[PDB]
């Protein structure tokens, strides 16, 4: 249930 960051802030997806 982790957040994977593409960039700073809201630039992420959860898996």
């Amino acid at each position, epitope marked *: 249930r982790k957040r994977i960051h593409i960039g700073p802030g*809201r630039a992420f997806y959860t898996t």
Partner: antibody
Amino acid sequence: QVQLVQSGGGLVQPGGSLRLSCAAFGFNFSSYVMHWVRQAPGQGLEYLSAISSDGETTYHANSVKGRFTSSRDNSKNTLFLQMGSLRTEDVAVYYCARDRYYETSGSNAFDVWGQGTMVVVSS
Amino acid sequence: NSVLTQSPSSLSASVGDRVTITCQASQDISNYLNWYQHKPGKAPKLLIYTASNLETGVPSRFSGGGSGTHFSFTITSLQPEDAATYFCQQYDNLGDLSFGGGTKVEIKR
């Protein structure tokens, strides 16, 4: 000024391959996260992909996940989209965009877009 | 899984008139909504980021507010230049990231 120009659009056979390129002008490309969006005729914008500034970490939407691959070459200031196994639902104007992060609010937007490139899937 | 409903889909108003577009979210998305302008053949343009904030180079004419599930975008004192399509974007995260249906704005003449 700060600008994005897109290339590689055209006609593809159903199931065939096409490579899209997005060139950056007027800004420091390597610092920014990049996105791919598309819009089908008569439909709303649909978000496709994100790629990290270093270019080794990507996100792909479920509609394209194991089909399109986002890549980038920073020494060439170019964002790429490799498209494979194409369908009728992929008929769209394709947009690349520049991500911005607003530290004061911990939030993000697409502050620079390209003029778009059209892809048609047909036999 | 975050569907956004934009209303109205069409819109026609005179120069100098005030007009307001509404966008509704199926989930609490705090303030992570942005508003864009799009003219045909041109590149889409960011006007308002995170509910209420103006991006630089965007005139005071444009305005935004709200939070949670309900959001509003106001163009005060319409100009002939504003004949465009205005669409919103939810950016809670990349996995949910979605767009409104858009509003076609016509200038009444």
